[PDB]
Each structure stands twice: as C-alpha cells, then as structure tokens.
Amino acid sequence: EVARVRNLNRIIMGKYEIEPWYFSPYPIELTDEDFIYIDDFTLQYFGSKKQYERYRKKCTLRHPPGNEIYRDDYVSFFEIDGRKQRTWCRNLCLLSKLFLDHKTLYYDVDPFLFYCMTRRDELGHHLVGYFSKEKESADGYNVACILTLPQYQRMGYGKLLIEFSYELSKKENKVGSPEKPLSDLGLLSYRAYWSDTLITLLVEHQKEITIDEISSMTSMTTTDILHTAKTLNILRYYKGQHIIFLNEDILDRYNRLKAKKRRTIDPNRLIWKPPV
Amino acid sequence: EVARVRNLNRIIMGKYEIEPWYFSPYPIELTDEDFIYIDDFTLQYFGSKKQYERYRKKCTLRHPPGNEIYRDDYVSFFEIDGRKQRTWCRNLCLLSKLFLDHKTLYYDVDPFLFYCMTRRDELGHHLVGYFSKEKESADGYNVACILTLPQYQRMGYGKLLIEFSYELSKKENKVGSPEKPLSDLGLLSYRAYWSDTLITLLVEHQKEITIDEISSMTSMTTTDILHTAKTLNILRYYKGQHIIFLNEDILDRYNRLKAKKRRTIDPNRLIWKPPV
Amino acid sequence: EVARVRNLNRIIMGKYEIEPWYFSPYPIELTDEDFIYIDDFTLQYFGSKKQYERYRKKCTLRHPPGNEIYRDDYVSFFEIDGRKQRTWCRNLCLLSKLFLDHKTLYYDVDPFLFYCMTRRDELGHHLVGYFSKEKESADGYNVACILTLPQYQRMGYGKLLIEFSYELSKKENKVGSPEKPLSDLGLLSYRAYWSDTLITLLVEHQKEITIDEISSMTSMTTTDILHTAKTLNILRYYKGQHIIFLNEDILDRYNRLKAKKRRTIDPNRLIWKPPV
Numbered sequence: 076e077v078a079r080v081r082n083l084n085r086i087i088m089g090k091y092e093i094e095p096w097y098f099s100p101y102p103i104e105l106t107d108e109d110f111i112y113i114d115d116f117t118l119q120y121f122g123s124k125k126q127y128e129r130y131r132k133k134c135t136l137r138h139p140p141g142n143e144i145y146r147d148d149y150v151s152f153f154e155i156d157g158r159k160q161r162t163w164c165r166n167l168c169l170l171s172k173l174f175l176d177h178k179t180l181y182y183d184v185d186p187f188l189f190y191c192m193t194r195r196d197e198l199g200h201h202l203v204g205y206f207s208k209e210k211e212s213a214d215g216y217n218v219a220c221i222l223t224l225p226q227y228q229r230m231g232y233g234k235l236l237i238e239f240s241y242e243l244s245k246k247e248n249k250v251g252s253p254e255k256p257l258s259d260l261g262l263l264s265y266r267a268y269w270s271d272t273l274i275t276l277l278v279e280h281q282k283e284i285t286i287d288e289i290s291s292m293t294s295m296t297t298t299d300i301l302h303t304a305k306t307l308n309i310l311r312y313y314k315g316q317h318i319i320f321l322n323e324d325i326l327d328r329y330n331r332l333k334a335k336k337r338r339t340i341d342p343n344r345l346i347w348k349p350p351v
Numbered sequence: 352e353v354a355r356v357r358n359l360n361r362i363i364m365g366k367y368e369i370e371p372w373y374f375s376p377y378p379i380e381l382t383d384e385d386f387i388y389i390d391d392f393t394l395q396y397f398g399s400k401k402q403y404e405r406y407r408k409k410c411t412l413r414h415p416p417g418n419e420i421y422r423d424d425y426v427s428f429f430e431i432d433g434r435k436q437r438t439w440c441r442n443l444c445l446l447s448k449l450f451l452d453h454k455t456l457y458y459d460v461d462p463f464l465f466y467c468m469t470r471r472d473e474l475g476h477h478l479v480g481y482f483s484k485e486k487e488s489a490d491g492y493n494v495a496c497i498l499t500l501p502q503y504q505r506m507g508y509g510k511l512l513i514e515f516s517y518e519l520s521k522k523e524n525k526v527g528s529p530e531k532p533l534s535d536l537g538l539l540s541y542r543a544y545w546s547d548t549l550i551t552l553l554v555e556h557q558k559e560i561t562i563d564e565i566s567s568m569t570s571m572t573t574t575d576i577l578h579t580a581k582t583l584n585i586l587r588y589y590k591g592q593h594i595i596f597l598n599e600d601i602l603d604r605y606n607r608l609k610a611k612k613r614r615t616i617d618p619n620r621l622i623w624k625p626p627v
Numbered sequence: 628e629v630a631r632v633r634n635l636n637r638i639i640m641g642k643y644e645i646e647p648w649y650f651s652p653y654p655i656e657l658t659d660e661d662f663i664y665i666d667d668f669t670l671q672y673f674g675s676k677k678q679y680e681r682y683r684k685k686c687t688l689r690h691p692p693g694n695e696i697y698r699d700d701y702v703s704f705f706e707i708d709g710r711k712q713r714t715w716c717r718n719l720c721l722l723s724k725l726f727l728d729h730k731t732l733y734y735d736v737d738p739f740l741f742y743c744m745t746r747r748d749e750l751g752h753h754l755v756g757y758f759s760k761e762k763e764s765a766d767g768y769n770v771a772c773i774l775t776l777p778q779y780q781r782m783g784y785g786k787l788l789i790e791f792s793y794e795l796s797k798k799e800n801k802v803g804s805p806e807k808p809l810s811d812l813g814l815l816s817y818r819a820y821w822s823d824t825l826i827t828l829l830v831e832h833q834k835e836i837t838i839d840e841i842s843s844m845t846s847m848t849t850t851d852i853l854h855t856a857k858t859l860n861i862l863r864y865y866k867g868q869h870i871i872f873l874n875e876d877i878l879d880r881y882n883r884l885k886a887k888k889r890r891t892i893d894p895n896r897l898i899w900k901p902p903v
C-alpha cells in the first residue's frame with residue numbers, strides 16, 4: 076500500500092484545465108488526487124466534480140458581485156468592496172496567488188477595492204481579469220495587484236485593466252503608479268502601456284508636450300513619464316521647460332500600434348464618483 | 352538519446368509518497384529519476400531504494416534524538432539542541448524547506464532548539480511535526496519555524512505544537528509570539544489558536560478578564576490579545592481597565608469547540624526547567 | 628472539449644531535457660504543451676521543434692558572443708558587456724531564472740558584465756555556466772549572480788567560476804565578495820571554496836599567514852577570511868597580529884583535496900586589464 080499525498084497540480088475552471096505557477100494556501104485536504112474545481116462565477120473551490128455540479132445548479136448571478144461602473148460593447152468593469160464581499164474576494168485572492176510569487180494574506184480583504192473585468196458575448200459575462208487597489212494608500216499606489224487569468228493572457232486584456240486604473244486616478248484628480256516591487260511580467264506590461272500612451276499623445280494631441288501637460292492628461296507620475304521618455308529618446312528642453320517631442324520613430328511606432336486594431340477604454344463610459 | 356535531468360517531484364517516507372510544494376537544496380545529483388527516499392526515523396535521504404533498505408536494517412533508536420520532556424497517552428515531545436545533533440537537525444530542515452517558501456540556511460542548526468512531536472501507537476513513535484526556537488531571540492520570538500508533515504496535516508497536530516510552545520513560555524515567565532512574517536497557513540493557525548484560547552478562558556475561568564490576567568495565564572502578548580479580542584468583538588472597559596467579556600456568541604463558539612472532542616496539552620506533564 | 632493551459636515543465640537543450648526548479652517569465656503563449664526548445668548556442672527559445680530546427684541551420688558562431696579573455700586546455704571564459712549583447716544576455720537571464728528563487732528583471736542587462744565559461748572538446752565549445760557582475764557595485768560585490776547549468780552541476784565547474792571571479796578582483800587590486808543574500812547552494816559552494824583556498828595556502832605557501840597577507844593573495848575580504856578561519860579552528864595571535872596556522876587536520880584536508888585531482892584556474896592565462 077502506497078498512500079499518495081499530492082500537491083495541487085491543476086485547477087478545472089469551466090472548460091479550462093490550468094496548471095498553477097506557484098503554491099496557494101487553499102484550505103483543502105491533501106489527497107491522492109491533484110486537481111480541484113473552481114466555479115467560474117463564484118470562484119468557489121471543490122475537491123469533487125460531483126460537489127461542484129451540485130452547487131453549479133443553484134441559482135446565482137452570472138457576473139462578479141459588485142456595481143457595474145463601466146460597460147461598453149466589449150467589456151464591463153465591476154467595483155467590489157472587499158469588506159462587503161469577503162467570501163468572493165477571498166476566493167479571488169486564492170486563485171490569484173496561484174500565479175504570483177508573493178501576495179498579502181488572502182484572508183484579509185477589507186482594506187481593498189477590487190475592479191473586475193468581464194468580456195461579454197452571446198453566452199453572457201466571463202471574468203477575464205482584475206486589479207485590486209488599497210482604499211487608503213500611503214504611497215498613492217493606484218494598483219495593488221493586477222492579474223489576467225492565464226487562459227486569457229496575451230489577448231490585450233492586461234492593457235485594458237491598466238488603462239482603466241488610470242481613468243480612476245484621472246477622475247480622482249491624482250497622479251498614481253502601481254505598487255512596487257512589480258513582477259517582471261507586470262513591469263514589462265506597464266512599460267509597454269506607458270510607451271504606447273506617450274506615443275499616442277504625440278500623434279493625436281500635440282507634437283510637443285510638457286511634463287505637467289502629460290501628467291494632467293494621463294495621471295502618470297513624473298518619474299514614470301521621465302523613465303519612459305528617456306527610453307524612447309524623446310526628452311528635450313523647449314520654451315524654458317522639459318518636453319517630449321514627436322519624430323519619425325514615434326510616427327512609425329504609432330502606425331504599427333494602430334495597425335494592430337486593439338480595443339481601448341472609453342473615458343466617457345466611466346460612470347463613477349470618488350468616495351469623497 | 353535524450354538525457355533527462357529531473358527535479359525532485361516526490362519523496363518516499365514510510366508508506367507515504369509526498370509531492371513537495373517548494374524546492375529544497377538536497378545535496379543530491381540530478382538524474383533521470385524524480386524521487387528520493389526519506390527514512391522516517393533518521394530523516395536521511397537516499398537516491399535508491401536499495402541504499403535506503405541497507406541503512407534501514409541498521410540498529411537505530413525509533414524516535415527523535417533528544418530528551419523526552421513531555422509524555423501523555425497521545426503524544427511525546429523531544430527537545431533537541433541543534434548543536435548536539437547537527438546531522439539529524441540538518442536533515443529535518445531540508446525536509447521542512449520542501450513545504451516553506453523561505454527558510455534560513457538549512458546547514459546552520461547550532462543557534463536553534465528543536466521541539467519534535469511524535470504520536471505513539473501499537474507500532475511505537477511516529478514523527479508528525481515540530482517547531483524550532485532561537486536559543487536567543489532579540490525579539491522574544493517563542494517559535495522560529497513550525498511544521499506539521501503534510502501526510503498528517505489537518506488532524507489537530509499544529510494546534511498542539513503551538514499550545515506546547517506557549518507552555519514553554521509560561522514556564523519561562525515570559526510572553527512570546529511567533530517570528531514574523533508568517534506564511535498564510537501559519538497565521539491562520541495562530542489566529543484560530545488565539546481565538547480558541549480566549550473563548551475557553553471566558554467560559555472556564557472568569558466571565559470578565561483583564562489584559563494582564565490573560566497575559567499571565569497564556570503568555571500571549573498584548574498585541575496578539577488585542578488583535579484577537581477586536582476580531583471577536585469582546586473588548587471593553589470595566590473597573591478602570593480593558594477587559595474581554597463573555598457573551599452568547601462566545602458561549603456558542605465554546606460549545607462547538609468542545610463538540611469537536613480535540614486533544615490538548617496537559618501543563619502538568621511538562622517536566623522541564625528553563626536554562627538559567 | 629477540455630482546453631489545457633500548461634506551465635513550462637521542461638526545456639529541451641541539445642540532448643538534455645531539463646525540469647525547471649522555479650518559474651521564469653518567458654514571453655511565450657501558454658498552450659496544451661509543456662516544453663520549449665532552448666538553442667544551446669544562441670539561447671533562443673522556441674515553441675516548436677520545427678521552428679527550432681529552421682533557426683539551427685542558420686550560420687552562427689559556436690561560442691558565447693564576447694571576448695575570450697582566458698583559454699586553457701580545459702575551459703575558456705568569455706567577457707560580455709550586457710549593453711552590447713542585449714538579446715543574448717536577456718536569453719541567458721531567462722534561462723538562469725528557472726533555477727533561482729529570485730532574480731532582477733531579466734530584461735535590463737545594461738548594468739552587467741557576464742563571464743561565461745565553456746568546456747571545449749572534440750566537438751567544440753559547450754556553455755556550462757556563468758557569473759554576472761555589476762559594472763559599478765556600491766558594496767564592492769565581485770559576483771552578482773552565479774550559475775552552473777543543471778546538466779553540468781556537481782562536476783567542479785562552480786568552483787572554477789568562483790576562482791575566476793577572484794582572479795578578476797586580484798587583477799583589479801581590490802578585495803571582493805559575492806552579493807548577499809546568497810541561495811543555500813551558493814553559500815555552501817563559497818564556504819567550500821574559501822575553505823579549500825586557506826588550506827592550500829597553508830600547505831603551499833607558508834605555515835603561518837596574516838590576514839593582510841591572505842587578503843593580498845586571494846582578494847577575499849577580512850570578514851570571509853575570519854568566518855572561514857573560525858570554522859576551521861585555525862585563528863591565532865602570533866608576532867603581534869592575527870594569523871591562520873597549519874596543523875595535522877589541515878594537512879589531512881589538503882591531501883584529500885589533492886587526491887580528488889580537480890582542475891583549477893591558471894592566473895597566468897588571464898589576459899585582461901581592468902577598465903580604467
């Protein structure tokens with residue numbers, strides 16, 4: 076007799092069978108099986124397909140449990156107060172930890188707001204990703220953690236999440252930046268976003284733009300703007316202050332960007348007021 | 352010809368075949384096999400079943416190599432000076448690292464005492480878990496690391512380990528708390544222990560108890576007591592100082608606790624004097 | 628229909644099929660397969676054997692892209708400026724992260740020099756390992772990261788890498804030490820190197836040696852020398868200063884060392900000048 080004591084090697088979420096990148100503290104018994112079921116609406120975990128099915132039949136809403144503060148023909152965003160949806164948010168944090176090297180104690184969700192993005196199609200809502208945000212951040216971080224579910228990665232969803240986080244900051248009349256340190260995956264996504272943003276501004280708004288003007292338009296911090304401008308070699312001094320400027324390289328990058336036919340966030344569709 | 356260079360994907364310990372959660376620096380060659388044998392008495396590791404068997408036949412004690420400072424009809428605890436049992440303790444630390452995200456250099460065991468708990472039955476002693484403790488802690492930490500072997504997890508052993516660590520502190524006439532930061536699994540276990548402890552005191556000892564009284568009786572720190580009391584909503588001011596108090600919720604939690612018929616540590620059976 | 632979304636569970640490098648120890652941010656799509664190909668010359672990654680083959684046929688150099696600053700009948704070392712070989716060095720850093728718990732953002736290679744060691748035989752050059760080094764280190768660290776590829780580990784290559792790093796420091800007229808914190812594997816390798824070095828000096832150079840003399844001869848720091856001397860019990864006071872001294876234990880260790888017939892670095896074959 077050999078008694079197997081297995082690690083969690085796969086989660087079953089709808090039709091997807093996903094392998095974790097890191098360990099996550101699901102409060103489950105270790106057994107001779109190496110899978111659990113994750114319900115794609117409730118995020119509840121189950122050791123058995125039968126227990127999962129039983130709960131699946133129950134009458135539940137088919138989208139994240141919060142206020143829909145943005146809705147276009149491609150995506151919705153739901154704003155959730157961790158304190159008001161403890162169970163669901165804990166479940167979200169356990170799922171997220173499978174794909175992060177480190178993360179704060181999953182159980183304590185009260186200090187956070189969660190902004191969860193769904194794609195909608197003929198079958199309704201499907202959660203594709205989220206970012207959390209501290210209700211009160213000493214450092215003015217506008218994102219605490221950010222995740223695109225692995226089955227949906229590299230489809231442009233992460234960039235939509237980041238863009239949305241800056242629309243919140245703009246509505247708040249504040250600059251902001253993601254919490255440090257960032258994973259390599261996160262930092263490379265932010266650098267691409269920051270780069271695409273400056274490039275788009277230079278072609279669509281004005282050929283020369285000051286640091287203050289960029290900050291006002293984007294809610295990016297001075298530090299992130301300067302780092303990005305130096306990487307693109309577009310930092311100059313004109314009319315007594317620092318600017319970024321348009322050149323052939325930037326025009327070329329812009330046209331390649333547009334060629335990709337990506338979706339973006341429409342600021343006009345954000346129906347939201349800061350807490351005051 | 353394909354030469355496979357495998358990671359350690361399973362350890363064989365008695366009848367158990369256990370999958371690691373994290374990497375551990377066993378000083379072994381990488382080969383086309385992905386298992387090692389861990390002897391459940393010596394904790395020695397072997398690349399081959401045959402080498403393991405050879406050493407298994409040798410005449411060895413059948414419990415951890417230290418002084419038995421506690422023995423009841425359910426468990427024993429052995430106190431081991433890392434400096435006096437370097438090999439065995441190094442082996443214990445390698446095994447433990449398989450289930451921890453981080454851990455101090457496994458090789459340097461001299462600064463630690465190890466308290467190892469066995470379950471005893473008709474077959475003798477079986478190591479189920481341990482906690483280490485710094486001989487000298489600047490922060491007064493009463494536990495450095497704590498582990499229940501995975502094949503024995505979720506059976507109540509972790510709570511026994513924690514309870515024992517506080518009996519040491521009480522005998523020492525000191526308050527103490529586990530080393531921070533704690534893993535999520537560790538912190539949730541401590542919170543349950545702290546919660547069960549306050550609840551039991553309120554039903555069994557006195558309906559209202561001051562912070563000083565709790566600390567004296569439990570060796571819990573002021574900080575851990577207050578955090579726990581606020582979570583349970585039982586913090587008040589009475590007769591000129593802060594207390595915790597009994598209510599219907601607490602009574603209900605107590606009866607559910609007792610219903611579970613758990614084993615506890617008997618302070619009378621701890622035969623031990625602090626180093627002086 | 629079950630859609631599998633797999634983690635990277637094996638890399639194929641020449642004839643070797645290697646299992647990663649940790650996650651690494653290869654910018655690849657997650658699919659129903661769990662392998663990638665790593666070209667053993669370019670370090671480029673490929674999702675398909677066919678794409679790999681296509682690029683393999685192209686005319687490339689068959690050794691690392693830098694200056695060969697050391698060449699004996701066993702190994703070569705190539706010095707590479709990260710800024711001058713960004714692609715190759717990024718690829719090296721992704722490969723290395725598979726075997727490290729943590730590592731700086733793989734993409735930013737400009738601040739580093741890479742010293743890459745090959746073994747040469749009838750088939751030419753084979754990369755077996757490397758160490759990186761900050762062009763400018765505030766702490767005077769003489770190694771930033773160090774790695775022997777897993778298929779080549781425990782063959783003595785790591786010790787050659789370390790020995791080479793100290794020959795650079797000696798040529799620079801500086802003491803140095805590896806960046807902290809070190810992995811357990813790294814620290815145990817350094818301790819063995821430091822120990823073998825002091826033992827060899829005592830038998831081959833002088834029976835009693837001062838701290839200054841050791842530092843001058845080895846580029847080891849005072850701290851690493853004292854730690855190593857205390858571990859070996861060879862620290863004394865003689866003629867008004869601290870020394871290490873030879874004894875029977877040391878002689879015995881030396882003869883066992885020589886018995887192993889290891890290769891070493893020949894300082895005479897390092898053809899190199901510091902940047903000035």
Ligand SMILES: *C(=O)CSCCNC(=O)CCNC(=O)[C@H](O)C(C)(C)COP(=O)(O)OP(=O)(O)OC[C@H]1O[C@@H](n2cnc3c(N)ncnc32)[C@H](O)[C@@H]1OP(=O)(O)O
Pocket residue numbers: 174175218219220221222223224227228229230231232233234235253254255256257258260261262264267654
């Ligand atoms: C916390 O502080 C922040 S740091 C922690 C970040 N989270 C984290 O590490 C969790 C795991 N990672 C992720 O969740 C995920 O990697 C993100 C969230 C970091 C990024 O999410 P996405 O994958 O969704 O990002 P995208 O917007 O898709 O961009 C990624 C790359 O994929 C390419 N892409 C995009 N759309 C594409 C289509 N249609 N076809 C092909 N390729 C596409 C993008 O170009 C982009 O960058 P690359 O140049 O590498 O592709």
Ligand SMILES: *C(=O)CSCCNC(=O)CCNC(=O)[C@H](O)C(C)(C)COP(=O)(O)OP(=O)(O)OC[C@H]1O[C@@H](n2cnc3c(N)ncnc32)[C@H](O)[C@@H]1OP(=O)(O)O
Pocket residue numbers: 102450451494495496497498499500503504505506507508509510511529530531532533534536537538540543
């Ligand atoms: C260092 O600083 C400390 S932080 C590092 C902690 N270590 C660590 O992370 C290593 C890996 N983890 C462990 O070793 C392990 O998870 C512990 C030691 C943290 C906890 O050990 P146990 O698993 O043994 O703890 P228990 O006392 O069993 O309690 C755990 C949960 O299981 C439930 N339980 C208990 N007995 C049960 C029976 N008979 N039947 C069913 N369930 C039982 C308990 O209720 C308890 O909490 P849950 O509410 O999640 O169950």
Ligand SMILES: *C(=O)CSCCNC(=O)CCNC(=O)[C@H](O)C(C)(C)COP(=O)(O)OP(=O)(O)OC[C@H]1O[C@@H](n2cnc3c(N)ncnc32)[C@H](O)[C@@H]1OP(=O)(O)O
Pocket residue numbers: 378726727770771772773774775776779780781782783784785786787805806807808809810812813814816819
């Ligand atoms: C950064 O700051 C530094 S800390 C990060 C270090 N890197 C890291 O962790 C990455 C992963 N690890 C490695 O790459 C690797 O483990 C090293 C680089 C740390 C060590 O490399 P090697 O494996 O090549 O080291 P060696 O010189 O081989 O010595 C290792 C042990 O193997 C034994 N050995 C050596 N030659 C042998 C032959 N011919 N036969 C049998 N055994 C041999 C050595 O004795 C040595 O120590 P042990 O006593 O454990 O063997």
